[PDB]
């Protein structure tokens, strides 16, 4: 432990900002003595041998709240000469030696990404995201954060880069695959609302490659359909939904999930006279499904869950509502 | 060795630690944690655990909300009691005595023991308020928490009236009611201290039936033994 000699540099670096704040009338001298003592205690806690990511986050939160307090006080005392750049630089320094000391803590990596995104640092955010993905490649949350922020920026090629490396790594759970199909169809909806893409064959290709993965269950394909069924206002949405249903019917013929997609298929983009027409079609499918030879307890639990989802909406007729209740109660 | 006697009185009257081993021992003295863990604990960890304890105590009883502002404050994480003046130390002593009178009823509970552990590990109540702390733990003199408080108490910081506890500090066993009653019949100071503690609580209406039954039993047995001592047969001596 050379921690005193190690923290001497960070205190001597933070000193001239305190000299500027003392030569302005923004912080008084007793308050600056308090800032000196608090930063000194924080540095000698941070550079200690036995340290913790919560200790690094407490120091980050204190420095960021000091920047916010000085911003409020500077706007109140009407000064424009004092800048926040030194505080952002030292907060980046705290975070860089934080991710040096504890690279295996995703809470601290995500706090670093939240800070770098919040003070408008996109290129630095991309570099931090690359380092975090290299250290935690099995983390679907980090991969979806990278891909969704690249899609939110609009660099769809970079979003596909992050997502295809993520689906190359995370193949135990379906989560990142579902989020990639969600992002690709959101790109398809953006390409539609801007008015290949005319076919929209990429989620069908995602399904065809996902057919051979170690998570490939009927529940996983039902999760694929439950992702796909949102935002039906598209062009090839009926093509995608019909391909999912014929894949599940050709592969898992008598599963309750396949009977559930047989129930809930024809209600794609409905909200309105086309609503109860397709509801009567789907209820015919549902009655045939309930009488048919399938695990009725599993199919009934699926249908009462979907019927709670149905009952969550207003603006319907009471006869339809009470016949949903009557068909619910005997399950 | 008159110089060694004067220096022994100075070292016993001194209060703040002045070398690193003394600071580590005085920080190691705790109620809950073992000493090997309690050396290496900053005042944010202790404040988090003991503020969870005080949140439970303040949800139990309503009248702990001024101590939420003055004793268990996030600023009271940082205050060193040995750096404030005599009037600040006396007002802090009044606040501590009021909290101990308030917390004496719930002291079998682990929230209240966590709150007393915060007072002990921050404000050093076992050194600066040994009288009120020892008196508020005296009605619970049959419990392991009293055994631990007796373990962490300094020896020369106990008042003269409670110096019957020295064999029970040398061998860590809870003292019996026979020992407390016999020292109450022998010393008037211990009986006056117990009665002064419970009357100072009962004037502030922070009584509880354990304390009332404790004081009633010990003053009854102490007046019994005191009459059996005072009886003499000679007329002027019995007068």
């Amino acid at each position: 432990a050379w921690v005193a000699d190690k923290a001497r540099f960070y205190l001597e670096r933070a000193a001239p900002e305190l000299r500027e704040w003392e030569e302005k009338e923004i912080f008084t001298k007793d308050e600056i003595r308090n800032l000196v003592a608090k930063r000194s205690d924080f540095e000698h806690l941070v550079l200690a041998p036995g340290t913790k990511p919560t200790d690094f986050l407490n120091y980050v939160n204190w420095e960021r709240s000091l920047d916010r307090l000085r911003a409020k006080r500077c706007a109140r005392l009407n000064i424009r000469s004092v800048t926040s750049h030194a505080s952002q630089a030292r907060t980046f320094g705290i975070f860089e030696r934080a991710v040096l000391k504890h690279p295996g803590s995703i809470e601290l990596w995500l706090a670093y990404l939240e800070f770098a995104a919040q003070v408008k640092a996109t290129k630095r955010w991309r570099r931090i995201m690359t380092r975090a993905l290299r250290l935690h490649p099995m983390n679907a949350s980090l991969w979806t954060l990278a891909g969704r922020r690249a899609a939110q920026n609009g660099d769809m090629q970079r979003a596909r880069a992050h997502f295809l490396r993520g689906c190359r790594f995370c193949t135990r759970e379906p989560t990142l695959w579902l989020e990639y199909a969600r992002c690709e169809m959101d790109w398809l909806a953006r390409m539609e609302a801007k008015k290949p893409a005319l076919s929209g064959a990429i989620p069908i290709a995602v399904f065809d490659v996902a057919r051979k993965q170690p998570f490939w269950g009927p529940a996983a394909a039902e999760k694929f359909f439950d992702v796909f069924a949102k935002f039906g206002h598209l062009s090839c949405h009926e093509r995608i939904i019909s391909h999912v249903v014929t894949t599940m019917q050709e592969l898992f013929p008598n599963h309750p999930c396949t009977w559930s997609v047989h129930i809930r298929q024809p209600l794609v983009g409905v909200d309105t006279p086309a609503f109860p027409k397709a509801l009567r079609e789907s209820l015919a499918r549902l009655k045939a499904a309930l009488q048919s030879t399938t695990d009725r307890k599993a199919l009934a639990t699926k249908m009462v869950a979907w019927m709670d989802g149905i009952l969550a909406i207003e603006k319907l007729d009471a006869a339809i509502r009470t016949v949903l209740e009557h068909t619910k109660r005997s399950l | 060795s008159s110089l060694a006697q004067q220096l022994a009185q100075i070292a016993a009257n001194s209060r703040s630690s002045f070398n690193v081993k003394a600071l580590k021992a005085s920080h190691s003295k705790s109620l809950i944690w073992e000493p090997r863990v309690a050396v290496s604990q900053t005042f944010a960890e202790i404040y988090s655990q003991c503020y969870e304890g005080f949140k439970e105590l303040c949800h139990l009883d309503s009248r702990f909300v001024p101590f939420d502002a003055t004793l268990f404050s996030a600023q009271s994480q940082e205050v060193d009691r040995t750096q404030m003046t005599a009037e600040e130390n006396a007002a802090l002593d009044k606040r501590v005595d009021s909290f101990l009178h308030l917390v004496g009823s719930r002291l079998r509970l682990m929230p209240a023991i966590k709150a007393v552990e915060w007072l002990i590990r921050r404000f050093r109540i076992h050194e600066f308020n040994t009288g009120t702390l020892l008196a508020t733990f005296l009605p619970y003199h049959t419990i392991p928490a009293f055994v631990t408080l007796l373990s962490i108490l300094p020896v020369q910081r106990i008042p003269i009236e409670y110096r019957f506890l020295d064999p029970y500090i040398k061998s860590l066993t809870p003292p019996p009611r026979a020992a407390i009653v016999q020292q109450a019949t022998n010393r008037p100071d211990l009986l006056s201290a117990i009665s002064r503690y419970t009357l100072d609580s009962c004037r502030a209406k922070q009584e509880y039936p354990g304390l009332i039954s404790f004081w009633g039993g010990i003053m009854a047995e102490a007046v019994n033994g005191m009459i059996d001592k005072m009886r003499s047969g000679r007329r002027a001596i019995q007068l």
Binding site: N34, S65, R68, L69, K72 | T70, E78, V79
Partner: peptide
């Protein structure tokens, strides 16, 4: 007052609250 409540909360968190601790003592 000329100070926001969020500014006073940041002042009590960042800078310390020693003066109001002494004020809460002497009551």
């Amino acid at each position: 007052a000329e100070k926001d409540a969020e500014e006073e909360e940041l002042e009590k968190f960042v800078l310390g609250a020693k003066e109001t601790f002494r004020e809460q003592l002497f009551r």
